[PDB]
């Protein structure tokens, strides 16, 4: 049952297993999902747990009076989520530049995304809807359009359907918003003004902006063909 | 005031004044932002308003006993995010397919993205790590993966705040990124014309009546 | 008018009339609209009557108190053009294969018409909706989809008791097979060249044709090598 | 059974499957087939979900005292009929014309089927029956012969068992084997470019206000 | 303020100042728009200066008891609209045709706006949307459905806000429009040198006495 | 008649049987003008309708005392024309710029269109002015300056309240700095050539788009050298 403790005592005793065997340490404390299906049963749980204070949701998997006096033993102990930085991958470790690089600029520094977005299909409106991939700026282009507006899909779904669900769609317009503002920034600039352009005006400007306000030259570098 | 009603007010006069302004029809509901800017006030709304049956952000800029008795008057209406559809871009148009031609198998055909990025992990991570383009598929996988990391990353901030969302990614946006990095996985492998030739082959089989076709699946192996 | 016995009588004496002239064998139950100019009734005499039987219809015009005792003669009988093929078309014949060579294939040998069509689509739609021919295959091709999405529109529009629920099923099974041995021929000599399906439509036939205990237990299969 | 209430329970049952799947408005009003199959008993489930005041067929497949604690489980939501518009064939368009030249021509220009059919049928009967190709406009008129052949089969089918349908095809149905009929006859006889030409100038006479139109509207003729 | 003596009899100033400068007759009547403006006053007086019957609007900037103890000092007497008859354009004059020439044709020979749109949105809209000119005629029918894009999307926005002025841009301002997209969209279908014959020739039909001239008004057509 | 209560029901059942026949989103609240043709009157229904809740106008025409017991049935439901643009032409996507290009200049960094006037006027009027084309600047700087001109004929005429007078505003704004930046781009192509604007165009793009504080704290001017 899903409000009975037998699911709780299941999957605790699946937790006091892992501490046994792997040398664990995860504090199971509830269950929002614990699947029933009969063939002995076939248990389908999930169990959330502290990973040092941190949650993190697995998944339980355990062939079990007559449902707590049976033969007991967990097989799976496969958790949901394999983007847990298993590949460090760069997004522009091609191209020449690096995401520390890309720090030069403050965070406020680039264009809304209707603003690149406007620029991107002002210039390259051909060249992106294409059928040969032209250059990689314009191959990691395409993918960087169509996850944001998978995004912005996901966030017109949560808002759409608790009530204060609006945090949720403030936190997609900003956070990843970030990160997709700077890789539209880095890969429009790079089809325009060149790629070493861009990438000594990131150590321009990382210069500019290093200097204290009182040695500062009033004019930023900036990325212009005049 | 961060919940009076002179900020419904306000938004009831921004949303009738877009709607006589640019021709369209916005039904506002609630207010989710109101900033105060003291030069006369120069405000800073933002409005949900009800558009034939989807509710959708706006953000807006007013300025205006002394509030009310001002001319108010509205300068922009822009909304948030521009996706409203004006790219028509394929994930798979630069390597010959499309996206129909991946919908052409079933959708459960697909390996989940667990075993997808373990087979991407495992086998090119010293290529998807490097500075080359060793080739355009490389250079979307690279993309592909990092948006799955993003997408995750999010799945676990609404756990930790605030479910249905988490499976409505996996459902939704997961199959999508199942698509593109079997696709990928699957065109650095065996190589592009050879994965172009087993999707219609694939297809073609799971459509003819089985007493008819090779009796066993299409699988594409060395 | 519509239900009057003279309507019936200016049809039957029509149909005796047509027994006199052109020596057909013909009867008649019912007229379903006659319409009237008068200038001397100048009707319109859309009547069926049975040639061979069946519920055909026959529009008539004919020259007619006074309208009981005047003139009556027909100048038009003529029925509503194609009546049933005047021109013998087989939508095979140009291509090689005939229908004789077709209708051997089993009714459920051929995937359902979503499937075709789904292979159709997302095999050659970029050659289908190209300006271009590029084969005659495409151009059968093309106006058997626009057939079957006509056809479907009726489907729809009959849905708007079980008497539609019937005509929707007959509109699915009975055309619709065609529509499906039409769409596996051309999308399959697309596919696998056009005389190896026609040396697999002469090898299934051999097959289909040996009885169940003399032949290899299972069908020949299409494939290109 | 067929009508009884455990298959109304599991229609709706699996339209709010569908609705927790693909997640829109679709209203169960009545199971439309239904069949019946022991294995655990299998259902093949023609139902009918209204979709706020549009109807198309659908399908479910719920595969189920004791028949009901059971797992029932839906696997398709799926259509009957792939028009939902995924492919745009446009039949004039590998001929040179597009629907919106075609439309230059009004609706009642077109001569009636009968004078269609029998001028094919006097003019490339020979050809229309041979086994080779001689045009595209060959093979797109054999189509429209024969797809009228339906249509008139199925008219004489419905008028054998039960109305107004039959007139919805000749009428409704019979507007475009009229236009492809007239497009094709009239391609192989003058021409194609004179048809292109024609239709040209067929759209500025019926442009014209009719004060200053003359009178007779333009014509294909060789002589 | 907006409605008071002081802005009147600084308008009323500002115009005699005005029959100072440039010495004519202008009648003030009203104030359009006013802006009272700190410095020592600024003001940015739209007012209105009737000339014998017609209305143009007009502008004023009079710098100004301490603000009328003041140098009063005007500087413009603008006019709003730069349509004096300064730049003498003819739309058809670069294409071989005048205004005296399509002046042969009347008034309501033009076919309607939705007429001559969908036959340029039939034959032309793939070269009408493709980014390289084909032609002067393209670059001149673009500005022309534009055009009229921006007169009916005022006309829509009049509809929203407050009558007659709907029907006036429809037939009145929409009378050039026409004229225009019959002159491209024929001059691209027929050629140039026959829309301008064609322009002569039926000038001679209807320059006739009605006892003499033909019941076929000429037409254009290609096949 | 007009104010009576059977157009409004001719127009309500109009816009419910296009909800039958055509399926669309529909709704009605008023009809402008209904002329009559009795030959079964030909109505003319003028009637605004709204597909997406807006007010914009359906011409209906409908076959109809016996004047509410009779058939009543759509024949006709068209609107006017060109509804909002069907064919989305760019007027400046021909001469290598788009829209989006010069969507980010400001409001006002465009002189006001006396100037822009004066300007073309004063340095191209003998080259606007003949018959000759020698560019397509010259070609859409005469239609827009003709449109410009028609425009404000119009203005003239509105002021033959504030009625009219915020009307005035309007087609001096609002179209207007559409007029503005068509002037500009066309005089600035011909005086400065034209891929020098067009890399104005980018780098101004470049310079609006960088927030206030990270960007040299004055535009980029546009000249040839």
């Known amino acids: 049952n899903e409000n009975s403790l037998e699911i709780e005592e299941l999957a605790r005793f699946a937790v006091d297993e892992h501490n046994k065997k792997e040398n664990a340490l995860l504090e199971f404390v509830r269950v929002v999902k614990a699947k029933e299906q009969i063939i002995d049963t076939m248990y389908y749980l999930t169990l959330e747990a502290k990973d040092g204070g941190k949650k993190k949701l697995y998944e339980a998997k355990v062939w079990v009076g007559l449902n707590k006096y049976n033969f007991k033993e967990l097989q799976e102990f496969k958790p949901v989520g394999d983007a847990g930085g298993r590949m460090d991958i760069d997004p522009y470790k091609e191209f020449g530049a690096t995401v520390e690089l890309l720090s030069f600029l403050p965070s406020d520094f680039f264009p809304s995304v209707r603003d690149l977005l406007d620029t991107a299909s002002a210039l390259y409106r051909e060249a992106l809807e294409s059928p040969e991939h032209c250059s990689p700026h314009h191959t990691a282009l395409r ?5 944001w507006g998978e995004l912005m899909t996901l966030a017109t779904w ?15 317009n900003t956070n990843m918003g970030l990160k997709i503002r700077q890789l539209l920034w880095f890969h429009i600039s ?9 990438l000594e005006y990131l150590v321009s400007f ?8 009182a040695y500062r030259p009033p004019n930023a570098p900036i990325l212009s063909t005049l």
């Not at 949560?158 to 997609?172: F, I, T, W």
């Not at 790079?190 to 861009?198: D, H, S, Y």
């Open 158 to 172: 949560v808002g759409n359907n608790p009530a204060s669900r609006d945090l949720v769609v403030n936190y997609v």
């Open 190 to 198: 790079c089809l325009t003004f060149g790629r070493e352009t861009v």
């Open 143 to 147: 993918q960087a359009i169509l996850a």
């Open 206 to 213: 990382g210069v500019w902006i290093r200097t204290p306000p």
